[PDB]
Amino acid sequence: FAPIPRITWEHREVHLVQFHEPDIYNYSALLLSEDKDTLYIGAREAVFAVNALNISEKQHEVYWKVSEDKKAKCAEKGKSKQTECLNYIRVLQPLSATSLYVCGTNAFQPACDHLNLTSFKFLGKNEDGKGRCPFDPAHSYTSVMVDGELYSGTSYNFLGSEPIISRNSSHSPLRTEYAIPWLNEPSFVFADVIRKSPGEDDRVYFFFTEVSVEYEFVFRVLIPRIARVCKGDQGGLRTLQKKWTSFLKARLICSRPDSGLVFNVLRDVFVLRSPGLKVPVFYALFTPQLNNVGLSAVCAYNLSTAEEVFSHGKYMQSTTVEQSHTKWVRYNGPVPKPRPGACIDSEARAANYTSSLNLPDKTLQFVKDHPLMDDSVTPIDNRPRLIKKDVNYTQIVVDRTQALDGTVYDVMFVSTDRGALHKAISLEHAVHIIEETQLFQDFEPVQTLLLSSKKGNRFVYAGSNSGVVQAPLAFCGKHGTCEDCVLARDPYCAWSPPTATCVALHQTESPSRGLIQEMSGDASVCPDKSKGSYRQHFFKHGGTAELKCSQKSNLARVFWKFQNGVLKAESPKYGLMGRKNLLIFNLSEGDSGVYQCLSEERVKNKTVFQVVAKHVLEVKV
Amino acid sequence: FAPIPRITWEHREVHLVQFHEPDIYNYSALLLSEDKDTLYIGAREAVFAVNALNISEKQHEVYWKVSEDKKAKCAEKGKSKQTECLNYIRVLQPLSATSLYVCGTNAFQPACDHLNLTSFKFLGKNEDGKGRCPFDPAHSYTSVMVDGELYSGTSYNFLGSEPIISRNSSHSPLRTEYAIPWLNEPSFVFADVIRKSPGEDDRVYFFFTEVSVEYEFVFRVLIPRIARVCKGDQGGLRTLQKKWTSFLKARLICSRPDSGLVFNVLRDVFVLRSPGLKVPVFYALFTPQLNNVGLSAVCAYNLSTAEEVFSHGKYMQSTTVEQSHTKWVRYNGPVPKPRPGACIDSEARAANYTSSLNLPDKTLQFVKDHPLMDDSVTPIDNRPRLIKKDVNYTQIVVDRTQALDGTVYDVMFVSTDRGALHKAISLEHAVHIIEETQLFQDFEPVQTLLLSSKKGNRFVYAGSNSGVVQAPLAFCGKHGTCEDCVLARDPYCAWSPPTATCVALHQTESPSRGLIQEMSGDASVCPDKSKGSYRQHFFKHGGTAELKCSQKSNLARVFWKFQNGVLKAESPKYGLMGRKNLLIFNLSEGDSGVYQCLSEERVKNKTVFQVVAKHVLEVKV
């Protein structure tokens, strides 16, 4: 299991910009403008536009509240008139340069509109949102705007049942079959397009947790799924009419068998796209369904691993489906030539199959009956990237950054259900949790996370029920000396001797080749050896002394030394107010002397020692 | 989840009698004399007889070490000569008033002998213990002597690859089939007889955890089982020759579906009989196989619940789905003439079947292929009696006692893998862990737990690798005041006004109707509440004094009061020395007076206060 965060920043010690609007709650949707200078925030009954560099600066705001009349009809349906019968923004996507596509629960009457960015006024289309936005604010949903087409995953009705993954377009509107083999009580998590290159079609991936049809246990077992459809899908001609002919799904496994750890509940997914790396990586956040005392895990998957399963793996087959009971097993028979679930490609095309509409019924009937793959999509290295006890993580974003020495790091930012944010990097041999910051002082769970993209200073935006918080990717300035800046082992921070400050790389002006940084934690490379704080004390004989000492690291052991020896602070001679401060009770002349508060922190190969504080004590009389 | 132990007794504050022999280890088998007040202990290479009233007092001792010859012959087999190639006693059972049946691993060469109690010397019978005793001291095992016949559950061979439950009698020795459907890599936990009326046969029940064949998951899932055979079984004539004809098993479930908690690994079972109980109760201890960060649970089962399943439940059926892959489903077909797996009772006698040897082959073939029941044996109330976090419980014994007001409590004594004992009860829809005692100072896991049968002063004996410990059912004498005594909410303890002491309700000569006990924890009625701890303080001016405050409640919030009003141990004038003690810095004079230390505790719906310490100090000017 990962260690505890090395440093804990109280909301206080650090600078965090916050945004919220009196009497407006549930800031669950965030979207950066195309120019990246503005951040759009979808909340309950409102949408705001704020400076992406300082979200406390509100630029625009618009409301879309439910009429008292409509709120009346909604309460009649037996819903909370003060919580449920409101318009919770659920879709907030880019439509064009001048507008956004916005959908809200509209008091259990899903509706969509266009937000004119120029006037920042809703156009008032009030389109039906059934199928693209849920009815209930508690229901799960996901969606992704792909070439002007909204691909959605959510519940089709008021009860939250009738799960549906559909693309509603003017031309080819497709959807999933209302059948357990396709979707079995799924909880939607994420959806994104994997296009890149190339005549290769683009695929839209959907991620969710659903009840497994292939696993049996004491009670219903949940299982995470990675699924995808082809953007160019057109539905079948006689079969799968107006339904996907490319829908395939597979298990997404995050576990540690030797430990009997199984994280079968998917919480979030992030697609890491790197200009320098040819294949995107899916970072996924899981929690266990069984005996969850508070465990969380992060697994990373190579897209090519997922692609090989859908393109070359075996399908599962429902052998016997009735009272003898439906059993799902590996299908060993022959597979229809145009591979079921495949996107129309060179071969398919080089055989007259130009669109899904002319695919053979054999191929179409097969896919309609075998949407589940037999193989599991496994993580990179076949193990989780991070497993953490005593924390319920809710979201994850990953930033690829280069340390001073060129080494590239995939820094994971994961929030918690208590409003905090952990920053971690895998440091080959273990996971290093650089720090944790309390984003929300009310301890509201973090519901959504978003990395800033503008060229320049980088930030993370976190949304919760009480507001949005903007945080920098690092607090380098918080480290007052080279040893500390170096011991943080934070790829974003380096020491700048000329300025005598721990600086944030890439964006900094400091001595490029003169900056210091050691991802090994070997502060021995620093120029000076800070000797901590120095202070003289003059106390009244008999009285009691209290010597202050404290440091930021949670992984360092601090102790006192006096006259070349380690002080044993117990009683009634000593105290220890704050498990750091030394207390000396019967102040007699024997207590006169030099007291040192040292710290020992085991880093990579070597352990580092530091003088935190030095006190010269003189008891008078 | 249950709370933490309310009171914590150090190994030294309470008095525990201990027994151990120099150089003798692994005290895993305990047996109480049928008549005499003697406790027989089987360790590695030895068997002792000690005073059950004071186990540290040895009465007899006989040894059975393996010669250096076989020691090497065994070490020649790839086993460790100084630890594995020794004679671990595994069976210690009563044979007759003057004899004990004893079996030991005997350097990977199971052997059984008689122990003449009179002379307390072995008869050198050297019977082959293959099947009745394991080869490896690390292999699971269990057994019970029934009418002079040993029913054993363990491994049949050197490697422990072949599991077996058998009765190797002189006339009708029976064993289980060496087949997956019967036993699938089981780990044996417990075995006991359930005597039956008038005519009905006695059943011998077996408890073990095995790899489930009916469940399919990410990886192999374990499942606890309760199984039984009929004592009168004689095997089949032309089918199941020399094999049980009454072997049936079923899943033993301990879970709380509401929070996704499932404890599928069985650790121990205890049968609660008590004269005021027409039907025994099975208390079982479980831990989870999945995501186990240290979770334990106790579930109680009604014997009649299991009987219903075995006599009226549907069987499961193996189905060779596809090819080479078998799945287990519920069987709905017709069930053979006399019920497969039933004992020879009335319906069979009435059909002229007087022995398993007369059962129709159709019935015998069915039971051979259908040993698994389709229904689960579920706990009383369908939920655990206790679920505890951060603890790994190893053994359990239960004592049914009656409080002073007549209320009956099933007190659960559960040991931990760190050598401690917890005493817990079900109190007003919640679990109350009365206390925790460190039985073994070496923190050795408690391997076996035994509860002595009511005979005035009762005890619990715990055996570990390092020795055997004896503890009373309560430490009533450790509660100094009536308030302490009542607050403990221990059904064994009551306050004796006449003697001004907390006494064991059932061993005191103090008039019972005068005794004070309130399981609600309300100590209002207690006499002389001006507790006890009272201190006088002569303190110099400008000095610094620590005011000691002691209370045993791990659940209490203690605070201080000053001249009527509740003080705030807040700097710069105060400071509590690590939760408890109040320090008064710079002994001024307005600081002179009486200091009260109150302990606040929630005892039901009520919040109560107890003056834990009274301090009267005057700083001399």
B-contacting residues in A 572-611 (Cβ below 8 Å): 572, 575-577, 585
Among B293, B330, B577, select the one facing A575 at the smallest CB separation: B577
**DSSP state for residue A446 in the 8-state scheme:** P
Contact B46, B61 (CB under 8 A): yes
State how beta strands B17-19 and B29-32 pair: unpaired
Q: Is A289's Cβ below 8 Å from some Cβ in B? A: yes
With CA atoms as reference, the chain B residue closest to A296 would be: B291
User: Which run of H or E residues covers position A467?
Assistant: strand A467-472
Cα A253 → chain centroid: 18
Among B291, B376, B540, select the one facing A290 at the smallest CB separation: B291
Residue B194 CB neighbour total at 10 angstroms = 18
Contact B337, B348 (CB under 8 A): no
With CA atoms as reference, the chain B residue closest to A375 would be: B218
What Cα–Cα distance (Å) separates residue A379 from each residue in A186, A253, A304, B210, B225? 22, 7, 11, 30, 35
Q: Is A90 helix (H, G, I), strand (E, B) or coil?
A: strand
Q: Which residue has the tokens 């309300």?
A: B522
Residue A519 CB neighbour total at 10 angstroms = 18
| Maximum separation of any 2 CA atoms in chain B, in Å | 103
What Cα–Cα distance (Å) separates residue B536 from each residue in B533, B541, B594, B619? 10, 16, 9, 11
Q: Is B284 helix (H, G, I), strand (E, B) or coil?
A: strand
**DSSP state for residue B373 in the 8-state scheme:** B
Question: Cβ–Cβ of B289/A543 closer than 8 Å?
Answer: no
Domains detected in chain A: 1-475 (2.130.10.10), 476-532 (3.30.1680.10), 533-621 (2.60.40.10)
Three-class DSSP labels, A344-356: CCHHHHCCCCCCH
Q: Is A329's Cβ below 8 Å from some Cβ in B? A: yes
Partners of B322 on chain A (C-beta within 8 Å) are 319, 329-330, 332
Partners of B292 on chain A (C-beta within 8 Å) are 260, 291
Select from A487, A458, A477 the least CA-distant residue to A608.
Answer: A487
Contact A18, A469 (CB under 8 A): yes
Question: Cβ–Cβ of B262/A577 closer than 8 Å?
Answer: no
Strand partners of residue B43: B46
Q: Is B585 helix (H, G, I), strand (E, B) or coil?
A: coil
Partners of B321 on chain A (C-beta within 8 Å) are 319-320, 327, 329
* Amino acid letter for position B560: W
Among B218, B293, B376, select the one facing A262 at the smallest CB separation: B218
Helices and strands (H, E) in chain B, number of each type: 5, 44
Question: To the nearest whole angstrom, how far is the Cα of B577 from the nearest Cα of chain A?
Answer: 7
Experimental method: X-ray
Partners of B328 on chain A (C-beta within 8 Å) are none
User: Which run of H or E residues covers position A307?
Assistant: helix A303-312
Total residue length of chain A: 621
CA distance B201 to B343: 7
DSSP E strands, B303-366: 316-319, 327-330
Q: Which residue has the tokens 């479930």?
A: B253
User: Which run of H or E residues covers position B483?
Assistant: helix B482-487
Contact A434, A488 (CB under 8 A): yes
CA distance A361 to A65: 48
Which two three-digit tokens encode residue B140?
């699971």
**DSSP state for residue A381 in the 8-state scheme:** G
Select from B485, B489, B481 the least CA-distant residue to B433.
Answer: B489
Question: Cβ–Cβ of B290/A260 closer than 8 Å?
Answer: yes
Cα-trace Rg, chain A: 29
φ and ψ at residue B139, rounded to 5 degrees: -80, 145
Q: Is A375 helix (H, G, I), strand (E, B) or coil?
A: strand
Among B290, B295, B329, select the one facing A325 at the smallest CB separation: B329
Report long-range pairs for A269-275 (Cβ below 8 Å, ≥24 apart): A269/A189, A269/A190, A269/A192, A269/A207, A270/A190, A270/A396, A270/A397, A270/A398, A271/A192, A271/A194, A272/A398, A272/A400, A272/A410, A274/A400
Contacts of B307 (CB under 8 A, 6+ apart): none
Half-sphere exposure of B408 toward its Cβ, with a 13 Å CA cutoff? 7
User: Which run of H or E residues covers position B363?
Assistant: helix B361-369
**DSSP state for residue A200 in the 8-state scheme:** P
Partners of A218 on chain B (C-beta within 8 Å) are 215, 253, 255, 262, 264, 376
Total residue length of chain B: 621
Question: To the nearest whole angstrom, how far is the Cα of A282 from the nearest Cα of chain B?
Answer: 21
* Amino acid letter for position B352: N
Select from A271, A261, A259 the least CA-distant residue to A207.
Answer: A271
Contact A267, A189 (CB under 8 A): yes
φ and ψ at residue A305, rounded to 5 degrees: -75, -40
Question: Cβ–Cβ of A585/B217 closer than 8 Å?
Answer: no
Among A218, A325, A576, select the one facing B262 at the smallest CB separation: A218
Contact A335, A315 (CB under 8 A): yes
Partners of A316 on chain B (C-beta within 8 Å) are none
Three-class DSSP labels, B49-73: EEECCEEEEEEEEEECCCCHHHHHH
Q: Is A68 helix (H, G, I), strand (E, B) or coil?
A: helix
Contacts of B348 (CB under 8 A, 6+ apart): B338, B342, B359
Question: Judging by beta carbons within 10 Å of its beta carbon (0-12, 13-18, 19+), is residue A113 exposed, middle or buried?
Answer: buried
Contact B446, B436 (CB under 8 A): no
Among A218, A221, A260, select the one facing B253 at the smallest CB separation: A218
Among B321, B544, B546, select the one facing A327 at the smallest CB separation: B321
Q: Is A291's Cβ below 8 Å from some Cβ in B? A: yes
**Resolution for this experimental structure (Å):** 2.0
Which two three-digit tokens encode residue A56?
């406390």
Q: Is B198's Cβ below 8 Å from some Cβ in A? A: no
**Phi-psi bin for A521: left (phi > 0), alpha (psi -120 to 50), beta?**
left
Select from A520, A519, A610, A482 the least CA-distant residue to A557.
Answer: A610
Q: Is A369's Cβ below 8 Å from some Cβ in B? A: no
Contact A107, A85 (CB under 8 A): yes
Q: Is A478 helix (H, G, I), strand (E, B) or coil?
A: helix
With CA atoms as reference, the chain A residue closest to B256 would be: A291
CA distance A489 to A404: 11
Contacts of B18 (CB under 8 A, 6+ apart): B55, B56, B467, B468, B469, B470
Contact B448, B440 (CB under 8 A): no
CA distance B143 to B146: 10
Select from B382, B217, B386 the least CA-distant residue to B295.
Answer: B386
CA distance B417 to B294: 11
Strand partners of residue B302: B281
State how beta strands A607-620 and A533-540 pair: parallel
Question: Helical H runs in B19-166?
Answer: 68-75
Select from B99, B106, B111 the least CA-distant residue to B49.
Answer: B99
Q: Is A153 helix (H, G, I), strand (E, B) or coil?
A: strand
CA distance B416 to B350: 51
Which two three-digit tokens encode residue B73?
């012959």
With CA atoms as reference, the chain A residue closest to B376 would be: A218
CA distance B347 to B339: 9
**Phi-psi bin for A349: left (phi > 0), alpha (psi -120 to 50), beta?**
alpha
Sign of the CA dihedral with B531 first, then B536, B542, and B547 last: negative
Contact A122, A116 (CB under 8 A): yes
Which one of A214, A254, A258, A290 would you mutate to disrupt binding with B, by most B Cβ within 10 Å of its Cβ? A290
Question: Judging by beta carbons within 10 Å of its beta carbon (0-12, 13-18, 19+), is residue A350 exposed, middle or buried?
Answer: exposed
**DSSP state for residue B117 in the 8-state scheme:** T
CA distance B204 to A535: 78
Q: Is B293's Cβ below 8 Å from some Cβ in A? A: yes
Instruction: Say how many CB pairs under 8 Å bridge A and B.
Output: 101
What Cα–Cα distance (Å) separates residue A18 from each residue in A12, A54, A438, B34? 13, 8, 12, 75
Q: Is A389's Cβ below 8 Å from some Cβ in B? A: yes
Question: Cβ–Cβ of A542/B546 closer than 8 Å?
Answer: no
CA distance B400 to B491: 10
For A213-259, give the DSSP string.
SS-B-SSPPEEEEEEEEETT----SSSSTTS-SS-EEEEE--EEGGG
Contact B38, B49 (CB under 8 A): yes
Q: After which residues is chain A broken (C to N over 2.5 A)?
A: 198
Among B259, B293, B543, select the one facing A389 at the smallest CB separation: B293
Q: After which residues is chain B broken (C to N over 2.5 A)?
A: 198
Which one of A215, A292, A293 would you mutate to disrupt binding with B, by most B Cβ within 10 Å of its Cβ? A293
User: Which run of H or E residues covers position A76?
Assistant: helix A68-76
Strand partners of residue A415: A395, A421
Cα A550 → chain centroid: 32
Question: To the nearest whole angstrom, how far is the Cα of B613 from the nearest Cα of chain A?
Answer: 19
Question: To the nearest whole angstrom, how far is the Cα of A531 from the nearest Cα of chain B?
Answer: 28
Q: Is A544's Cβ below 8 Å from some Cβ in B? A: yes
Q: Is B213's Cβ below 8 Å from some Cβ in A? A: no
Partners of A221 on chain B (C-beta within 8 Å) are 217
Among A540, A572, A576, select the one facing B542 at the smallest CB separation: A540
Contacts of B137 (CB under 8 A, 6+ apart): B26, B44, B84, B86, B88, B90, B105
Among B219, B255, B540, select the one facing A218 at the smallest CB separation: B255
Partners of A250 on chain B (C-beta within 8 Å) are none
Contact B208, B193 (CB under 8 A): no
Contact B515, B496 (CB under 8 A): yes
CA distance A89 to A27: 9
Select from B28, B31, B2, B23 the least CA-distant residue to B65.
Answer: B23
Question: Cβ–Cβ of B291/A319 closer than 8 Å?
Answer: no
Strand order in the sheet with A248-252: A187-194, A203-211, A222-230, A248-252, A372-377
Sign of the CA dihedral with A241 first, then A245, A250, and A252 last: negative
* Amino acid letter for position A315: Y
